[PDB]
């Protein structure tokens, strides 16, 4: 046998409800976004395979993170870093 | 000449040299580059 | 020398905390989404 004591502010519980409602929504939606983003990445991997078959230099340069020459060795790419050249050290023949 | 090839075979590759079998390779034996773009979406934690 | 006066409602500050927490989260996550979206666009350009 006891006596319970009640607070004088529902606002703790109303904040709890508002925060939980907003959190359910944002967690659900950002989870859907992340899931769809993974699916997009795995889904784009096919296009990336086709492109790397097409122009392996550009795809390898983008994926590795630096200008690199590449060529397919079957189902793998062989990369080799390209030497930068100063802009002023390049001359175009007119014809 | 200089015919080096890696072919996907099961869970790994089957490295070939000069049109002759060399050995199988584990999938992780070759450096991996990611075409994926990381979207590190963590979740708003429960707060009481 | 003075006397301070205190409000009778923390709920302003609790709203401030809830809003700031949710805003930090959503701003961070939408910023990550936008950054990854730019990276996706530049990446798809190839």
Curated annotation (Swiss-Prot), chain C:
Q: How is it modified after translation?
A: The cytoplasmic tail is phosphorylated by the viral kinase US3. Phosphorylation may be linked to a down-regulation of gB expression on cell surface. ubiquitinated.
Subcellular localization: Virion membrane; Host cell membrane; Host endosome membrane; Host Golgi apparatus membrane
Superkingdom field: Viruses
- What's this protein's family per the entry? Belongs to the herpesviridae glycoprotein B family.
Quaternary structure, from the entry? Homotrimer; disulfide-linked. Interacts with host receptor MYH9/NMMHC-IIA. Interacts with host receptor MYH10/NMMHC-IIB. Binds to heparan sulfate proteoglycans. Interacts with gH/gL heterodimer. Interacts with the host coreceptor PILRA.
Q: Name the job this protein performs.
A: Envelope glycoprotein that forms spikes at the surface of virion envelope and binds to the host cell entry receptors MYH9/NMMHC-IIA and MYH10/NMMHC-IIB, promoting the virus entry into host cells. Essential for the initial attachment to heparan sulfate moieties of the host cell surface proteoglycans. Involved in fusion of viral and cellular membranes leading to virus entry into the host cell: following initial binding to its host cell entry receptors, membrane fusion is mediated by the fusion machinery composed at least of gB and the heterodimer gH/gL.
Name of the molecule in the record = Envelope glycoprotein B
> Which gene does this sequence derive from?
gB
